[PDB]
Design a protein around this ligand. Structure first.
Ligand SMILES: OC[C@H]1O[C@@H](O[C@H]2[C@H](O)[C@@H](O)[C@H](O[C@H]3[C@H](O)[C@@H](O)[C@@H](O)O[C@@H]3CO)O[C@@H]2CO)[C@H](O)[C@@H](O)[C@@H]1O
Ligand SMILES: [Mg+2]
Length: 339
């Protein structure tokens, strides 16, 4: 019976990622990593704005790698831990629902080599122990997401669910994450712990191989920027949404139902969104089909927002952080009013 996770999650309207921020990897062992990819230092005002618009839930991606001491302790540098805590606290002050993850660890130590299971499991555990300790007293609105898109970068199946041996590794790493957090006690004993598939992929073979922990206070995370060719820019990508491709979303959702929802397993889309391609009207329609699909079973999603809209890059930006204004209110309206 996993109904406690469902009740907690049902309180979310819809979520928002503080993207390209604490996940950013410049600056080395320093708090400047936060601004290394060109975003301003996060403020209470920024979080207020996110919450006030209707995003009562927030994902705070954090890349810890460069702020970790040497193995085997992997001590998180105090300055970095304190800063992460500050940013989390912004959301706590606003009584928001919060996901804390580890993020671009995949650039560093998190390489899904089955033969290195122990070392990977131990490092993940050593990081989450310290995090779980630092957030021991935080209430049930704070959730942990162990990994972000855990995978072997450059591998043939990097972005399509990895290999069978890798997926078994993921199951072991998921288990190590849960184990380390539960062992810290306090509010971490029944805290919602959000696990993931290889690369956060949601294809049937990726889902089929997913070991579901017996721990009843967990949820499964997936990333679905579906369809890829609408949401991203690439050879073969399009910006028109007439509804013809709704099937690609429908098809994928049924697998998620088949393997998770219809077994009573909580599911969360911890990342989704569409890059701006001068196509407000189309994205609004896509949001209707996509989020409306998730709303069929009360599944919540968190929108990726990297604060890139005018300039070059992947245009997932929605909140102009420096002006505390939204880049595109029609798109945002569709998100926050999805119900
Ligand atoms: O999963 C989120 C992740 O997506 C990354 O893009 C991946 C896509 O996930 C994947 O669907 C796509 O597959 C396409 C392939 O790369 C193309 O070359 C072409 O052959 O068609 C495929 C569609 O079946 O690959 C991309 C490659 O990046 C994003 O990079 C990343 O931001 C995000 O986290
Ligand atoms: Mg308690």
């Amino acid at each position: 019976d996993r109904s406690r996770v469902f009740d907690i999650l049902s309180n979310i309207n819809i979520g928002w990622n503080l993207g390209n921020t604490l996940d950013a990897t410049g600056g080395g062992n320093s708090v400047n990593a936060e601004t290394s990819w060109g975003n301003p230092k996060t403020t209470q005002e920024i979080v207020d704005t996110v919450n006030d618009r209707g995003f009562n839930a927030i994902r705070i991606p954090v890349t810890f790698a460069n702020h970790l001491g040497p193995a085997p302790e992997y001590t998180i540098s105090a300055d970095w831990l304190a800063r992460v805590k500050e940013v989390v606290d912004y959301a706590v002050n606003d009584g928001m629902y919060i996901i804390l993850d580890t993020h671009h660890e995949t650039n560093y130590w998190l390489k899904t080599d089955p033969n290195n299971e122990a070392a990977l499991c131990e490092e993940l555990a050593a990081i989450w122990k310290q995090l779980a300790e630092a957030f021991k007293d935080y209430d049930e609105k704070l959730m942990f997401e162990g990994m972000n898109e855990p995978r072997m970068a450059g591998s043939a199946k990097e972005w399509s669910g990895g290999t069978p041996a890798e997926r078994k590794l993921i199951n072991a790493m998921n288990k190590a994450f849960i184990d380390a957090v539960r062992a810290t006690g306090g509010n971490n004993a029944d805290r919602v712990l959000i696990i993931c598939t290889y690369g956060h992929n949601s294809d049937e073979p990726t889902l089929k191989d997913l070991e579901i922990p017996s721990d009843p206070n967990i949820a499964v995370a997936l990333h679905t920027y579906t369809p890829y060719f609408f949401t991203y820019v690439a050879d073969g990508s399009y910006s028109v949404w007439n509804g013809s491709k709704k099937n690609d979303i429908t098809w994928q959702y049924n697998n998620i139902k088949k393997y998770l929802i219809d077994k009573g397993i909580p599911v969360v889309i911890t990342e989704t969104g569409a890059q701006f391609k001068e196509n407000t009207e189309d994205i609004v329609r896509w949001i209707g089909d996509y989020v409306g699909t998730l709303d069929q079973d009360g599944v919540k999603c968190f929108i990726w927002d990297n604060n890139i809209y005018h300039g070059n890059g992947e245009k997932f930006g929605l909140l102009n952080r420096s002006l505390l204004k939204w880049y595109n209110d029609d798109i945002v309206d569709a998100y926050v009013n999805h119900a």
